[PDB]
């Protein structure tokens, strides 16, 4: 009866998924143009999409016209140098000479200037969009990633993020992360940690302008699309779990609250990544597929709220790959804000989530 409201929500959220094809078509066309234009440039010759065939992703479950795209570009024989003790932010250096290095034009002494590479990236896409019909660049103010935001027609918006790709083994700060062993298995954790990692240009703590931040959204996607202890989770009537549903609700709950109190400015610092990160932690605490039965959707969603609430109240939310990086440290989000969102979430669940209606 109470899980009934939740399924109602999900059905209406699912509604904005049939006509993706008409908008996703316009996104694919614009990013193919931009890729080909950037490949025509020496510094960006190896540029490419993250998952070809998965052009876009939807960060905002409630804004289906807002698309997220990642352009990756391989940097062979990269040498990272961790910035301060932040565990997630790195200066980028090169094992090889600038003659062997196409990013050579972007060096600032020994390090890869994120601001120089971003400037050129933006200029090319900017100059190129001027020769694409119904598209404009609204572009920034987010540390570097995303680099640009495009406005296709006057309706669809695409965030384009540059990312360096490295095929070397993941940095030491990730040694004790990705604690999937009891859930998806040690075999799988070992397979995933053989994949590339990415660095996206992001400022760090005034600010340090040339840092890069580790990014694992390709691993996040891989886990969500292959998410169960049973290899056949969600492949038949008898093994339908509510993991993905719960993450949607978590996401929708935060976006609605952010909308509900946009005039107040306490929830501006929270994002979908925070509830995705907490969601993965809950999967780790609850690794059996029987702890996510669809008939238990109400109870499962409640556990995600209760975990997240404890994260706010204790001010701990470890990045799921870099356990010593705390998304909720007082240096990143202040206590007043966490207490405000605590109060609202606590209100919402005590009244069967009126923000859902
Ligand atoms: Zn499943």
UniProtKB/Swiss-Prot annotation:
Site Important for preferential detection of curved long DNA — annotated at: 28, 36
About its domains, the entry says: Lys-28 and Leu-36 residues are specific to human and destabilize the interactions with short DNA, shifting the specificity toward the detection of curved long DNAs. Lys-28 and Leu-36 also restrain cGAMP production and, therefore, immune activation, allowing a more fine-tuned response to pathogens.
Membrane topology term: Peripheral membrane protein
Marked site, Cleavage, at: 159-160
Describe its function. Answer: Nucleotidyltransferase that catalyzes the formation of cyclic GMP-AMP (2',3'-cGAMP) from ATP and GTP and plays a key role in innate immunity. Catalysis involves both the formation of a 2',5' phosphodiester linkage at the GpA step and the formation of a 3',5' phosphodiester linkage at the ApG step, producing c[G(2',5')pA(3',5')p].
Q: What is this enzyme's EC? A: 2.7.7.86
Q: What, per the annotation, is the impact of changing residue 221 to A/E?
A: Abolishes stimulation of interferon production. Abolishes DNA-binding but does not affect translocation to the nucleus following treatment with etoposide
**Chain segments annotated as coiled-coil in the UniProt record:** none
| Source organism of this protein record | Homo sapiens
Where does this chain carry the motif KRKR-loop?
140-142
Altering residue 32 to A: what's the impact? Abolished poly-ADP-ribosylation by PARP1, stimulating interferon production
Could you say what the effect of mutating residue 140 to E is? Reduced nucleotidyltransferase activity
The impact of changing residue 56 to A is:
Strongly reduced tyrosine phosphorylation
Recorded protein name is: Cyclic GMP-AMP synthase
| Record note on modification | The N-terminal disordered part (1-160) is phosphorylated by AURKB during the G2-M transition, blocking CGAS liquid phase separation and preventing activation. Phosphorylation at Tyr-56 by BLK promotes cytosolic retention. Localizes into the nucleus following dephosphorylation at Tyr-56. Phosphorylation at Ser-272 activates the nucleotidyltransferase activity. Dephosphorylation at Ser-272 by PPP6C impairs its ability to bind GTP, thereby inactivating it. Ubiquitinated at Lys-251 via 'Lys-48'-linked polyubiquitin chains, leading to its SQSTM1-mediated autophagic degradation. Interaction with TRIM14 promotes recruitment of USP14, leading to deubiquitinate Lys-251 and stabilize CGAS. Ubiquitinated at Lys-14 and Lys-221 by RNF185 via 'Lys-27'-linked polyubiquitination, promoting CGAS cyclic GMP-AMP synthase activity. Monoubiquitination at Lys-187 by TRIM56 promotes oligomerization and subsequent activation. Monoubiquitination by TRIM41 promotes CGAS activation.
What happens when you mutate residue 251 to A/E? Abolishes stimulation of interferon production
Which residues does the record list as N6-methyllysine (modified residue)?
343
Which keywords does this Swiss-Prot/TrEMBL entry list?
Acetylation, ADP-ribosylation, Antiviral defense, ATP-binding, Cell membrane, Chromosome, Cytoplasm, DNA damage, DNA repair, DNA-binding, GTP-binding, Host-virus interaction, Immunity, Innate immunity, Isopeptide bond, Lipid-binding, Lipoprotein, Magnesium, Membrane, Metal-binding, Methylation, Nucleotide-binding, Nucleotidyltransferase, Nucleus, Palmitate, Phosphoprotein, Transferase, Ubl conjugation, Zinc
Q: List every position bearing (Microbial infection) Deamidated asparagine.
A: 51, 226
Region annotated DNA-binding sits at 14-56, 221-244
